[PDB]
């Protein structure tokens, strides 16, 4: 992580060398510099939120007792839950390397091909979804708006939880 040259760093080097808290601290302090210069007050919770959503994928280093590929870029939550159920048994989990994608690649690379198709590059998404024979579980806020049911966010939260526990 120490500098072998000089210049501005890219927050993937920061990510994979100095960690994840280093890159959140970097992105937060930088966008907050840009705002604070103009006298805009924005609490940091919000920038930490968008950063969290920029760290969702995770490449795999070694499979282990799991069933992911080698260089497959799986989501971080799938890895977390799979390894947490493996360590519940006696097996040994999988080691991963966090990724960091911009807000435009972390949206097209989410788990629902209806969110992605309604965001951007519709043809490019429906093609890959069609050949991969994908399947959308209807779970975000935008798919429940497109379809026409309650968003799972406010009062729709109570509704959707009742409906999910009914199965």
């Amino acid at each position: 992580g120490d500098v072998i040259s000089d210049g501005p760093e890219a927050p993937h080097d920061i990510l994979r060398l100095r960690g994840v808290h280093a890159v959140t601290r970097y992105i937060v302090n930088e966008v907050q510099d840009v705002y604070r210069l103009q006298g805009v007050k924005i609490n940091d919770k919000h920038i930490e939120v968008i950063v969290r959503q920029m760290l969702r994928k995770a490449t795999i280093v070694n499979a282990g007792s799991s069933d992911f590929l080698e260089g497959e870029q799986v989501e971080y939550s799938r890895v977390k839950i799979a390894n947490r159920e493996l360590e519940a048994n006696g097996k040994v989990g999988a080691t991963y390397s966090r990724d960091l994608l911009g807000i435009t690649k972390a949206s097209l690379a989410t788990e629902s091909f209806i969110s992605a198709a309604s965001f951007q590059e519709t043809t490019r998404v429906l093609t890959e979804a069609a050949v991969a024979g994908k399947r959308d579980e209807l779970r975000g806020l935008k798919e429940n708006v497109i379809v026409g049911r309650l968003i799972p966010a406010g009062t729709g939260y109570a509704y959707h939880q009742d409906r999910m526990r009914r199965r």
Partner: protein, 79 residues
């Protein structure tokens, strides 16, 4: 009369369950025949329900208990 819903939110401490409880109660007063638990001052059903939630004498548990009690009463009278 009603302007602010702060007290009703303090009673049902979520402000998202407040909406659902008060909506259940107001649809009781409006579609159903049930009458207000508090003297209405020419308020609509929603404000009456919110004002009941504020004076304490209704919430989700109370509503569910009343509903179960009256269901059992109707079933008993059904013979």
């Amino acid at each position: 009369a009603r302007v602010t819903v702060q007290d009703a939110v303090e009673k049902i401490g979520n402000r998202f369950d407040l909406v659902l409880v008060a909506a259940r109660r107001a649809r009781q007063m409006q579609v159903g025949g049930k009458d207000p638990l508090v003297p209405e001052e020419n308020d609509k059903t929603t404000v009456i329900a919110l004002r009941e939630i504020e004076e304490g004498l209704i919430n989700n548990q109370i509503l569910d208990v009343r509903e179960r009690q009256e269901q059992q009463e109707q079933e008993a009278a059904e013979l």
